[PDB]
Amino acid sequence: IIKPAGDSAFLISFGDEISEEINDRVHSLAKAIEKESPEWLVELVPAYSSLLVIYDPLKASYEEVESYLKRISAREVERIKGKTIEIPVAYGGEFGPDIEFVAQYNGLSVDDVIEIHSKPLYRVYFLGFLPGFAYLGGMDERIATPRLEKPRLKVPAGSVGIAGKQTGWYAIESPGGWRIIGRIPLRTFNPGKVPPSIVLPGDYVKFVPIDEKEFW
Numbered sequence: 590i591i592k593p594a595g596d597s598a599f600l601i602s603f604g605d606e607i608s609e610e611i612n613d614r615v616h617s618l619a620k621a622i623e624k625e626s627p628e629w630l631v632e633l634v635p636a637y638s639s640l641l642v643i644y645d646p647l648k649a650s651y652e653e654v655e656s657y658l659k660r661i662s663a664r665e666v667e668r669i670k671g672k673t674i675e676i677p678v679a680y681g682g683e684f685g686p687d688i689e690f691v692a693q694y695n696g697l698s699v700d701d702v703i704e705i706h707s708k709p710l711y712r713v714y715f716l717g718f719l720p721g722f723a724y725l726g727g728m729d730e731r732i733a734t735p736r737l738e739k740p741r742l743k744v745p746a747g748s749v750g751i752a753g754k755q756t757g758w759y760a761i762e763s764p765g766g767w768r769i770i771g772r773i774p775l776r777t778f779n780p781g782k783v784p785p786s787i788v789l790p791g792d793y794v795k796f797v798p799i800d801e802k803e804f805w
Contacts, residue, residue, distance in 0.1 A: 591658050593651075594641060597631075599658055601640040608638070609727055610710050614665070615640050621665050622658075629654065673710065673793040678749050679804040680706070680771035687768035691734045691751060702770060705729045706756070707796040713788045721760025721778035723788060728756045740766035747773035749796070760786070771796075774804045 594600035601618065603611050615635045622633060622642070629649030634641040644654045680703045681688045692699045711725040728751070736752045741764065744750075748759040750767030759765060760778035778786045788794055 591655065591662065593655075597646045598641060598643045599655060601642065601658060601662065603638045605638050608709070608729075611638050614669075617669075618662065618665050621661055621668075625661070627657065669710070669793065672791075673795055674788050675795045675797050676773055676777075676788075677775065677797045677799040677803070678707070678771040678773050679799050679801055680749075682801070684772035684801075684804070685749065685770035687737075687750070688770040691732060691768050691770055694734050695732055697731070702732055703798055705732050706770065707798050711756070711794040711796075713790050713792045713794060716786055716788075716790060718778070718785075720763035721786065722757060722763075723760060723777070723786070724755065724757045725794060726755075728754055730754055734768045737766035737768070740764050741769075744769060745772060747775070747777065749773060771798075772804070774799075 590602045590604060592600055592602060603614055615638070619633045619635050619640055622630070627649070629644045631643040631645050632641070642654075642658060681699055688699055688702055692702045695702075697705070706729075709727045709729060711727040713723060714726045715724040716722070717724075732751060733754050734751045743762055744759045744765045744767075746759060746761040748765075748767075748769045749771040750756065750758065750765065750769045752767040757767075758773055758777065775787065777788070
């Protein structure tokens with residue numbers, strides 16, 4: 590989101606949001622630009638939710654520089670879209686027993702847990718098999734919540750939980766003491782599918798709140 594920034598400069602702007610996903614967009618974009626090295630490039634100054642771009646006005650016209658940054662940002666968003674798997678989660682109620690305590694331990698409503706949880710773009714950083722679990726990075730800290738004092742013996746397949754600053758899900762029924770906030774209806778790990786998990790490390794995940802009814 591792309592605005593002029595004074596003398597021979599533009600600011601890409603994401604914007605206003607201190608955020609690890611934001612931080613990495615900035616960085617990835619600066620990188621995407623550095624991959625081209627356009628001949629008109631003077632400086633790139635990342636900030637937490639923006640990137641300053643400065644150009645040599647003898648090399649590139651203003652209108653050129655503006656257009657190009659619009660085009661390189663389009664292609665960054667398309668690259669990240671291609672890497673993004675959308676995951677429906679029915680949050681609260683029977684599907685997540687522990688959501689009320691997550692809210693309350695953090696001083697929020699349940700609806701707020703749901704927005705804060707499903708807002709980021711998560712990175713899949715590790716997968717385990719047998720029992721399958723997907724471990725994710727990128728959770729907002731306002732929903733951080735320690736584990737149950739004693740684990741449940743049977744967590745249904747698809748449970749989305751929190752455990753400190755981590756979120757992830759139980760791919761099949763298994764023990765665990767993570768705070769369960771929602772359940773996924775997709776069979777996320779399926780031996781005898783190729784590949785056998787729907788996300789692989791290095792993929793991104795977008796959780797998508799659904800109701801009970803387009804859960805079943």
